[PDB]
Design a protein around this motif. Structure first.
Motif, PDB file in Angstrom:
ATOM      1  N   UNK A 149      64.365 -27.817  15.921  1.00 19.19           N
ATOM      2  CA  UNK A 149      64.472 -27.643  14.481  1.00 19.19           C
ATOM      3  C   UNK A 149      63.186 -28.073  13.782  1.00 19.19           C
ATOM      4  N   UNK A 150      62.785 -27.294  12.773  1.00 21.43           N
ATOM      5  CA  UNK A 150      61.681 -27.635  11.875  1.00 21.43           C
ATOM      6  C   UNK A 150      62.180 -27.541  10.433  1.00 21.43           C
ATOM      7  N   UNK A 156      53.866 -30.762  24.526  1.00 21.09           N
ATOM      8  CA  UNK A 156      54.196 -30.328  25.889  1.00 21.09           C
ATOM      9  C   UNK A 156      54.300 -28.823  26.084  1.00 21.09           C
ATOM     10  N   UNK A 157      54.168 -28.050  25.005  1.00 25.01           N
ATOM     11  CA  UNK A 157      54.198 -26.586  25.090  1.00 25.01           C
ATOM     12  C   UNK A 157      55.471 -26.108  25.797  1.00 25.01           C
ATOM     13  N   UNK A 158      56.617 -26.493  25.239  1.00 25.15           N
ATOM     14  CA  UNK A 158      57.922 -26.170  25.822  1.00 25.15           C
ATOM     15  C   UNK A 158      58.687 -25.124  25.017  1.00 25.15           C
ATOM     16  N   UNK A 159      58.025 -24.511  24.035  1.00 22.79           N
ATOM     17  CA  UNK A 159      58.657 -23.515  23.161  1.00 22.79           C
ATOM     18  C   UNK A 159      58.388 -22.092  23.648  1.00 22.79           C
ATOM     19  N   UNK A 160      59.430 -21.271  23.631  1.00 20.23           N
ATOM     20  CA  UNK A 160      59.310 -19.871  23.995  1.00 20.23           C
ATOM     21  C   UNK A 160      58.467 -19.123  22.960  1.00 20.23           C
ATOM     22  N   UNK A 161      57.783 -18.084  23.426  1.00 20.35           N
ATOM     23  CA  UNK A 161      56.973 -17.250  22.555  1.00 20.35           C
ATOM     24  C   UNK A 161      57.867 -16.175  21.938  1.00 20.35           C
ATOM     25  N   UNK A 162      58.618 -16.573  20.922  1.00 20.13           N
ATOM     26  CA  UNK A 162      59.478 -15.663  20.173  1.00 20.13           C
ATOM     27  C   UNK A 162      59.857 -16.340  18.853  1.00 20.13           C
ATOM     28  N   UNK A 181      63.137 -21.649  19.766  1.00 21.95           N
ATOM     29  CA  UNK A 181      63.755 -21.693  21.079  1.00 21.95           C
ATOM     30  C   UNK A 181      62.928 -22.514  22.058  1.00 21.95           C
ATOM     31  N   UNK A 182      63.594 -23.437  22.746  1.00 25.97           N
ATOM     32  CA  UNK A 182      62.989 -24.227  23.816  1.00 25.97           C
ATOM     33  C   UNK A 182      63.254 -23.480  25.129  1.00 25.97           C
TER      34      UNK A 182
END
Length: 225
Positions: A173-174, A133-139, A165-166
């Protein structure tokens, strides 16, 4: 002897082929590493199918031989000791409440260039999850990589958690399990337990219209006085 290959700035190439839930993609990266300062600068470009996963989820997969090992810890640096012939690096990355990546990479010198060739396979991802869903911030948040010797495979194992970060303020978490084994027949260094202190920073090239990621990363070995 491998450590002597890293006293200066070394060019780096990264090539990844990926399949996540049947979505095929490829990434090409270029840059350089300066292990004297634990410093990596890399630019990655997505070259085939539309990137089906967020860039931050690929950072750990896309050259720990560029870590700065303090002088008193040099005898624990497996990664450089395997060079130039290199090592296989394998991971299972479990995204909490979502799918998993399995990665197999070979990291070695081709001439004077350090190369990371990767195959990545992702399965079990949720359609409306944080990844597809591409819900992760670019950081990126600044990661202790815990390392131990694996004597039976003349290599090492590692484990660590990263937190992505979402966009709603939460975190994805990974969990990472890692194994490295030498490719060649030279002697390698089997370390005492220690960790790598890692900090990654992501940015964009304002003149780049292709889907891409610029990475600046600093890594220092620690946990031994």
């Amino acid at each position: 002897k491998g450590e002597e290959l890293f006293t200066g700035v070394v060019p780096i190439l990264v090539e990844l082929d990926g399949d996540v839930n049947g979505h095929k993609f490829s990434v090409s990266g270029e840059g350089e590493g300066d292990a004297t300062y634990g410093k990596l600068t890399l630019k990655f470009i997505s070259t085939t199918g539309k990137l089906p996963v967020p860039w931050p989820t690929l950072v750990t997969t896309l050259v720990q031989c560029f870590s700065r090992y303090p002088d008193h810890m040099k005898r624990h640096d497996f990664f450089k000791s395997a060079m130039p012939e290199g090592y296989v690096q394998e991971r299972t990355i479990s995204f909490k409440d979502d799918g998993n990546y399995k990665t197999r990479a070979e990291v070695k010198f081709e001439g004077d260039t350090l190369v990371n060739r990767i195959e990545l396979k992702g399965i079990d991802f949720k359609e409306d999850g944080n990844i597809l869903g591409h819900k992760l911030e670019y950081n990126y948040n600044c990661s202790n990589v815990y390392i131990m010797a694996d004597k039976q495979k003349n290599g090492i194992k590692a484990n660590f958690k990263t937190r992505h970060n979402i966009e709603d303020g939460s975190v994805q978490l990974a969990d990472h399990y890692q194994q490295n084994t030498p490719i060649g027949d030279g002697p390698v260094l089997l370390p005492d337990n220690h960790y790598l202190s890692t900090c990654s920073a992501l940015s964009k090239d304002p003149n780049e219209k292709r889907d891409h990621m610029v990475l600046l990363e600093f890594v220092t070995a620690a946990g031994i006085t």
